Each structure stands twice: as C-alpha cells, then as structure tokens.
Nucleic acid binder design. Sequence first.
RNA 1: AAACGACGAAAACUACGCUUUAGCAGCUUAAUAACCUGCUUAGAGCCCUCUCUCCCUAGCCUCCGCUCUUAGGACGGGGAUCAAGAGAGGU
RNA 2: CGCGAAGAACCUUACCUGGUCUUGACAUCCACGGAAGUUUUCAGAGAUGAGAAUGUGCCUUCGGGAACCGUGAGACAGGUGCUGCAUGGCUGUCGUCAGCUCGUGUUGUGAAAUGUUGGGUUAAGUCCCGCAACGAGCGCAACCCUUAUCCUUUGUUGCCAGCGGUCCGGCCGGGAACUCAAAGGAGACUGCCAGUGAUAAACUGGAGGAAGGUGGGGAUGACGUCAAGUCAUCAUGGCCCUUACGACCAGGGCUACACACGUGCUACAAUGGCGCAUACAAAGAGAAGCGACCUCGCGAGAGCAAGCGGACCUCAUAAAGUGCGUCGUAGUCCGGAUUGGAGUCUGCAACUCGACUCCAUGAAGUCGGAAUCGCUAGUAAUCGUGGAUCAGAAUGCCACGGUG
Lengths: 127, 212, 151, 99, 100, 83
Amino acid sequence: NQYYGTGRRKSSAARVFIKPGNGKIVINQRSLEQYFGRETARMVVRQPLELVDMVEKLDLYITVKGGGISGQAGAIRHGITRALMEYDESLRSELRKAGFVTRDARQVERKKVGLRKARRRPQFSKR
Amino acid sequence: GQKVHPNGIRLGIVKPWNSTWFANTKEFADNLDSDFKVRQYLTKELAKASVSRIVIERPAKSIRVTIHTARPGIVIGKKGEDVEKLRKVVADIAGVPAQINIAEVRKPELDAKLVADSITSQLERRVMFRRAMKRAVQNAMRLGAKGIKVEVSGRLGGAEIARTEWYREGRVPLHTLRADIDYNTSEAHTTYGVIGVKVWIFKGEILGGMAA
Amino acid sequence: PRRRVIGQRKILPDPKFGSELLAKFVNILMVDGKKSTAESIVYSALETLAQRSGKSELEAFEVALENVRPTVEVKSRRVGGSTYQVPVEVRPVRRNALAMRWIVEAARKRGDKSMALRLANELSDAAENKGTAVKKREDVHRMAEANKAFA
Amino acid sequence: RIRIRLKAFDHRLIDQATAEIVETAKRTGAQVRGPIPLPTRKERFTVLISPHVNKDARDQYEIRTHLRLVDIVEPTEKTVDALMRLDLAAGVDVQISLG
Amino acid sequence: AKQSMKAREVKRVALADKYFAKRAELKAIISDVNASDEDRWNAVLKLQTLPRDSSPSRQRNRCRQTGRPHGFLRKFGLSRIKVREAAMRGEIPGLKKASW
Amino acid sequence: PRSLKKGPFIDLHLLKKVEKAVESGDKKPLRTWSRRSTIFPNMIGLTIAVHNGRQHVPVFVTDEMVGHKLGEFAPTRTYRGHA
RNA sequence: AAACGACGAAAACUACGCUUUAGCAGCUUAAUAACCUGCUUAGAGCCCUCUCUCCCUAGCCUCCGCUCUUAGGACGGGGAUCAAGAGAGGU
RNA sequence: CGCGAAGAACCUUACCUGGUCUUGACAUCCACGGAAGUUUUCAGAGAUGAGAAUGUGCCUUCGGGAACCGUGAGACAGGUGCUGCAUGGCUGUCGUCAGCUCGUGUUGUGAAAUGUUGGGUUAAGUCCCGCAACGAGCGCAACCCUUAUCCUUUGUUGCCAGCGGUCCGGCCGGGAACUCAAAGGAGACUGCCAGUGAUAAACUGGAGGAAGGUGGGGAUGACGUCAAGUCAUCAUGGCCCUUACGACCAGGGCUACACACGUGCUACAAUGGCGCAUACAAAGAGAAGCGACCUCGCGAGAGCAAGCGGACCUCAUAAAGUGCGUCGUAGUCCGGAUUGGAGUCUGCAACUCGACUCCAUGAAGUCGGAAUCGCUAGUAAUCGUGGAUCAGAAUGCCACGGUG
Ligand SMILES: [Mg+2]
Ligand SMILES: [Mg+2]
Ligand SMILES: [Mg+2]
Ligand SMILES: [Mg+2]
C-alpha cells in the first residue's frame, strides 16, 4: 500500500504516506484542523485530492518539518502530488495541468553588503 | 588599486597555500608571527641564492619550513652542514622543534619572485632598465610560459618622477578562474629612491583543480 | 522596461469558491501580509451582502463591480514641467483591477465598527450605485471627458 | 569503544587520512564502522578593506572546519598500536577516544 | 604602532598575570555574602592601592603585528587591514573569499 | 554602582588627613585631589578644597551628604550660556 | 607652460661551464641554415667533490631500557697512500 | 557626513591641567657588581623616592658563563609632527558601463583609415550576414560559491517506512526508504517540435520537464578619469625636534551648545494597543568559557550550582499567525520620552558618563510644504532571532528565516 512522496517548498519538507481508504488525513500527529490554523492552508493541503476525487476514498499520514505555515503548508501539497502520482501515474497530467507538480524554488536572497535588506538601499542624501 | 589580488582568489582552486596546519583561535597570531620572522630571516640569510617560495607546516607541535630555491649550494654549504647550522637558529626562533626541507626548482625562471629578481639587482648596479626589462621578458618567454605581465612603478631607470609602466607578452588572463596565475611583488632600492615590481605569470589551463 | 516587455502573471484560483476576480480582490485588499484576516473580513462581508441583496455572492460582487466600473485612465504624459495630462481608455483587466482597488479604498475611507461592516455597507451602496466608488468614477470621468480638444 | 575524531579543512586530504586508518584497521583487525562525516562548521567574517575612510569596501570570508568520526567498536591486540604508530600527515588533527 | 604605547600594553600583561591568585580570592571573598564587613573593607582598601594599570579590565586588546587599537579580532589577533593581506597572501589555513 | 557589601572608597591618605583635622581642631581647608572618592560622616564640619584641575574649589560639607561622591559638587566645564 | 625618444646594435649567474645527437618551434610558397629557442637522452673530451678498488679486523645490530645472548638483513669499526677502473652528484 | 570608530567612565586615544626626567617608556653596545627575584614599612593623589625582611636558580681552568637587574657617558633612541603636490601598498566613483588595443594584410604620396563600421539580436565588441579584412590580448559568458529534480557512498549525537516490548516517551531491539550530515555525480544544451526572421543568428509561443531560454542569487571591477582619500594600520627618499615635538602617571574633556543638516529607530491608533490557551525557522558562539536545574526576588539578578572544543548542553517556550475575551474613536488603557528615588549586571571607580529593572509625573506627536529616496518577486513592506567589538556600553554594522 503506502505510496510515498517528499514534498518541499521554502525551507520546509513533507513526507506523505498515502494508502487506500477514507480521508483520515493526519499531520505531524495532530489532525489537519488542529495542525493548520489559517483555514486557507487547510485547503492547499486538500487541493490535490480534489483534482482527482480521493478527498474521501484514500487515507494519508504526513509529518512536515521545517519553515513555517508560510510554506510547510505547501510542501504537503507537492508531496501529496508526488505520491498521488505513484498511485496511478495516469494522474500526472491533471496534476501537472494545475501546477501541483512543480517544486517552487522561490527561496530568500542574502543581505548583500552595503544594501540593508537585499535590494533596498540606504536613502541617498540629496546633494 | 583597481585589479583584485589574484592569489587571494586562486587560493581555493589550484594555487597551494603557505600555511595550513591546525590552530584554534589562540596561537595562530603567534604562529603567523613566527612564520613571518622565519621568512624574513631566510630572505636575509639567502639574499644571494635565488629563493621564491617558503611554505610552513606544524605537525604535532613541530615546525617544518620548506624552501623552494634555485641555488641550494650556498644554503647547504661544504660537507652539508650549513643547512643544519641554520636549522639550529630557526629552531631557536620558533621555540618548538624545527626541521627544514629544500625543493630546488629546475629551470626556475617561471617563478614570479625569481623572475622579478636580479632585475632589481641590475637596476641597483645601474644596468639599463630597458635592457633589464627586455631580458626579463625574453627569459620568461623562452621557458615555454604563455604570458608574463610585470608592473614597474616609481622612477623608471632611477628617474625623478614616479611613473607607471608595464609590458605584456603572450596572454595573461585575470578573470578566468581556472588559469594558474602566479603572482608576486618585489622592491628595488637605489640611490634615487625605491621602485616597485609586481609580476603576474600565466602558466596555462589547469583542469581538475587540486589533487594534480 | 524599454526592451523587456513581459506578460501578466498568474494568481492562485482562490480555493474558497474559485474565482480570479475574488483572488485579485483578496490580494489587493490585504496589506502587511495579513491575507488571513483580509480573507475573513471580505468573506464575511460578501456573505452578508449575499443575503442583503438576494442574489448569489459571486454574481452580486460581479454586478456591483460592473455598476461602478470605470472606463478612462487620466495619465501624465506631458512633455516636460508644463502640465499636460491625457485621458485614455482602459484595458479590461486594469479596468477591473482599478474598480476593485477603488472599492477596497472606499472600504478604508468609510469607517465603522469593523472593516467587514465597512465593506458590507459600501458594497450595499455600490449595488445601487452609491457610496464612494461611483462618486470617484463620476469625478474622474467628468474631467476626463471635458478635455477632448487635447489629444 | 575506541574512536578517532578527524578535524581538517581539506576533503581531498581528510579522506586520505581516513583511508590510511580504516585500511590499517581492516588489515591489522576488523569490525570497522567507516567514516561518518559530521556537519562541517563554517564561520563567516566581514572585513573592511578600507585603510582610512570607505564604508563600502567589504570582503566576506569564511573559515571551514570538517569533522569526521572513525570508531572501531571491537579492538584487537594490534588495532590500537597500528592506529597509534601512524606517521600522521600535517594539517589534520586527531582526537582519539579509548573508553 | 607607537613605541610608547607598545610597552604599556605589555606591562599591563606582565603585571596582570602575577596578581591573579590574590585578586581571584579577594573577588570570591567580597562576592560571597558569608564574610565580615571589616575584613571586606580592609581587603578592598588593600586592593585599591595595588598598581592601577595592573588591572585585567584596564587594557585595550592591541593588535599583534601592527598594534592598531581598533578592529582587533579574537580569531586572528590582527586588525582588518593586516588580516586582509594575510588571507590574501594565503597564510591562514582555510581563508578563502566566500559566497553563500 | 558598587556592591552593598564591598564598602566605600575613601582614600588611605584622605582618611589620615581628616583624622588629623578632627583631633587637631583646625579651621584651615583640607585640600584633596581625589575625585571618585565617596563621603564619610566624620567630615561634617570641615572645609574641603577639592581639586579638578582649574582651582581648589571649596566645599563646606553639610550633614546632608554621606551616601554619594564628593565630586558631584564640583563640575569641570565652564559654561553658563551661549551668549 | 612644459612630455623626448640614441649603442643587451657596451646580454652583467653560467644554473658548473665546456662538447655533440633526435625531434619541436619563430622565420617563409614549401623548406633549410645560423641560432632563436627551450626540450627527452646518449657518451665521453675536460677541469672535478664525495663513497670507493688498500690492508687490518669480523667488525657487525636490537626487542628490556644493560647483557654472552636470537630467524636475520640493505647490518657494518681503525690507520699512510692512491696505480687504473666504478657509483653518485656539482659549495 | 550611523564615516574610519567591530561599542571614548580611568586605562583609554592623538586633546587639556599640575607636577618627574635625559643614549630616556621602548632598541644592539663596553668596564664590571649583584641570581633573577617574593612579602611587606614609609612621604607623596600620582609620577618614584628611601629602603628592610630575603633568595643565592643551572654551569668551563675559579684573568666564569647564559638569563635578568644597576650605574658611567659615548656608539643611540623616540615622534599618532608635517609633506597622500616624492611615494609604495590599499580603497571609492565613472562602471559589471561596454568598450580599450595589438599582429599581419589592404587603402591613401602622406598624416592616417579598415578591422572596431552597417541590418537583425542580446546583458554585452553576445551571435549571424554583408563589407580588405583576417586573427589575437585585456574584455562578455563560462570555468569559482550556494539554491532548485534525481543517483550512490558512509547511519552518529539524527529518522522512526515496517515489526516488538514499552513507564507513552523512539527509551532501545533494529534498520538504512526517507528529512537531515558530508563526498563523488546524472542533470537545462536552443536539446525539440511550429511561426516570424535573410532557406541565417535570433525572438515568440507549446511539449516534455524539478527547473526554459542566463534556471535562480554571490565574488570576479577591462586601458584609463577624479595632483580623488589615508605619510593616523604599515613602510617610506628628503625637513624636523636630541636636557624636548621624546618620555611619566593621576584628574578632566572627546559625551558640550541660542543652532541648521544626512540617516534610522520610535508612534499617529479599530489590520491598532491590553492581557489569557497555541503554533511553525535557518544559521550561528562557547574552557580567564558557554553556563541546564533548584532555592528567591512584582522585576533586574543574588546564592547553590549538572553537562559540554559540543548533530550531545547552554545562549533559545521566537513572533507576526491562530482561537477567545476586552476596549470604541478619545492626547486615547495610543504614544514611553523628561523627572525624584530604589536596587541589579558589570569592570579597582558610573555626579561629567553605561545598560537593565520595576513603583510613581506620563512630554512631544494625532500621516507632516516645497522638495525627496528606495525598490520589477519570494523582491518591496512587516515580525522576531543570530553574529563580530568588548569588563558591560547598538535605533549603528553584518547575516537568518517567517509572512507576503
Ligand atoms: Mg625615492
Ligand atoms: Mg549593429
Ligand atoms: Mg520550454
Ligand atoms: Mg574592555
């Protein structure tokens, strides 16, 4: 059973262990609602199983560990996708046809010397 | 003041270091001072023999000094005892037990310091500066090198105005991060002042970096 | 950019109901990265407006936006320090964006107990062409159409 | 029960130093655990290269420190002597623990 | 690199490395409340007429090679201007320009 | 400040001079050069000329200064208005 | 306000030099040739230094730090000289 | 112009005020004498004068030697004094802007030109074509450092996919699928299909793809310009002071002031402050050290104090977020400065001149003219944390991630 994935996004990292049965999503021990506050996030982590129809026909079990709701919220999706693919692979299409298969590389640049926040520059004293 | 120092950017690619023992934030100021003192004593002791590089190591509370020269005869001396005689004084300077090694270079005119040397000597003994420059260029070119850029600053040929002059034969890259750029600088003391001599030498393309 | 001419970026599909218009409204109403409370406020206001108008939430939002939808942007393409502006027609995407920006700006302009209540009260006026959005549209259109000899 | 912590700056020489002890153990004994590379410590420093006044000329350098573990759980009569009779190369540092 | 200032600094070490035990025990005694007022007062009065310039926290950390009184670094014991030329020449086992 | 149990910082010599003044009963000012020294109650009733580099400024110490430094009564700058 | 241009055509250690051999390269129609070159090695011309071919002795050494002492090996101690050959190297 | 200064109470740091000096505080040197040296006694604020209690530390022919003190000058010191219009070295700007040159050939009697120009294209003298141009160097890019998909190796201080006991804690029994740890690689190259373009270069779409056109960030600053800035990091040819510009320590002042200015933090209050569950980071520093607990303190921290050169312990229950309550538009339960006093950290000493604390007064200010500056994507903008300087003394500096 256990089809697995490893979603990543920002400085986060997931670990989805899909299997066959009934919702029962459970993240880092807590259940979805308990774990994710920003209800928004509680939808990114259910989006993939919506483009298919396994929202209520499969199980799950994740354990994300890095970052913040910021992107931990997302790493789940990536993974839930990589592993969904290993359930049938015919889904690759729809899932790519929705952006859920790419890992966003958007990172966070470095404070460069002289600047003050990566890009922002000390105000210039006019003349 | 415009170009970057090439050795400090070629340290981690091809060019070896001159000090790579192991200290922890306590004795490296002392180790650095000891290395500087032994190098400045070696220069004064072998000002006649052409000496280019001095490397240091500290394995297990003991100092090893390796000298890369072209005239080991003077330093060795008769019966092979002057090397030990000066090892005694360098051990006294360094405190910890000391040993020295010689890495005599065959055809060393491709060494930056030894190619920047003896032209200072000709300038000191008032040989023509242009003759010295062209002789240095031809000597550095005849050994198979692919380019030497030597910079001469201050009173060319014992002049009265500090001017800037530089010759360039072949190709001497400075932005390529794979090209072996041997760089050094020396000074000449004359009756009219001081002159600076900076030398870059482009050995050729070296792929694979370290580990030969 | 003089040479680099880029297209238009894509936004999230707003998984609350699913609408690019709603996603754009949310991401322009939010400030200081407070998208969570911005979404809560806008969704509460829209759900109240649905019952207050009798229609669906998305349809009531779309028609309210259309009823206050502008047509002309008054830009400053003057040749120098001399004041010489110019009105021009607006593309549909920037038109919708400007209309919803005016809506969310009137939301901040008019104060009440909560921003959700302000948004609900201002949408209940934009439904029958009242409030601040329609007034601003009229005030921009009068000065954009009164200057026709200047091309 | 006996282990050696290797500390260096060069992965092209610390690996040779590790090989020269793991092969020695596998020759005059057995039951090795291989080289375990610990997270290397990198210390960064920003240095101004302005002699008198220039608050823009900065260089960002970093010092590396690579750590490896070589633990031989079961020693023979010859393992300790073979791993202590070594002519260790310069630059690397050994912290040996024989509990 | 003033010669006059280069001797006071070494005196502040050659004198501070000698009074270590007496100062340590005096600090421990006057820091532990389980003491006597007269003894503590006599101890502090004896400590204060000890040479002033022999105190540990009365010498500024001076650079090793050039003695620049600013920018002294614990890691190298050298100022920025000298550590630049040291790391650029390559005498510091591991100092390479960096890029995160 | 200083620890409560460490004690004040009156000088070796200053204490000797004030003891001499108090059992000799002299009205002449006692000049002192210390500036970071504290005050003792036994100096009440004496004139102390404290030195700050410019002049030996006099202090007729009251019974209202024990727990502070005697140098607070003698500034060193010279300024009583821009104009 | 100024800024000329002449003679490694007065090669400034020989790195022992001194000899000589194959190829490379700058030269140009292709080449050679001087050498303009470094560059692998060959042998001895010719000054050389050291261990030698001398004999005596069996010296000899090494884990225990001392020892008659044990498989053993590349292990090896004193005195004048070198006739001609042989290993290295060049203060 | 938040510049050196990566942290001026004394010390400090070059400035000021009183006093001591002279081959001097610190360098080589002779005639010799005392082992160097440890505790205290005293006059002076101090600068350094007297001195005693003492030690005779290892060694040649003992017409003694190293080491350290002491005196006598002369051979010497010393200068943060100046000259960045003598300079070396270094740095900033023009400017990571894209140009700056050379060899041969050709053209013109010649100075000189071509190449380097012209169309497409680009970030580019980047690529193509044409054209007496052909090539080359410094040059634009790459080779250098990280991120983004995947492979293997090694599995501790880390993971529990599966199995078991289980104090419900990965505690170990175990293991190397994974996240992580460091080493070697596959890997995005216009590689493709279509259009446009000159049957080119290229640009635009789409397909695969983890990523697409440089995939995404950083160092690398081309000949040259600014008598550009530092003889105050340093060295340095000349002037210079040689019984003081050298040198001595204590106390002040570098921190002050009717003022004007660069920059930033702090606030304007309903997305905002008051409090009570509650959540997710990375990377770091640690032995004259980092410093868990505990007893306490309304609070700073006091005492006792485990472990750890550390994938082990500390700094360090991170917040914004989230669910509740609450306040209601008011100089405000906003805003936290000035003030009197209180202790605490800290270093011999915080009146000049530290920071922390909490009780108390609770300023200004309520989005600010003309002007003006920064940003094109995980960037603006907000929130907190970390790092170096240093006895402590960051709204400055350098980094780190969250939201977005
Ligand atoms: Mg000169
Ligand atoms: Mg063109
Ligand atoms: Mg593509
Ligand atoms: Mg300090």
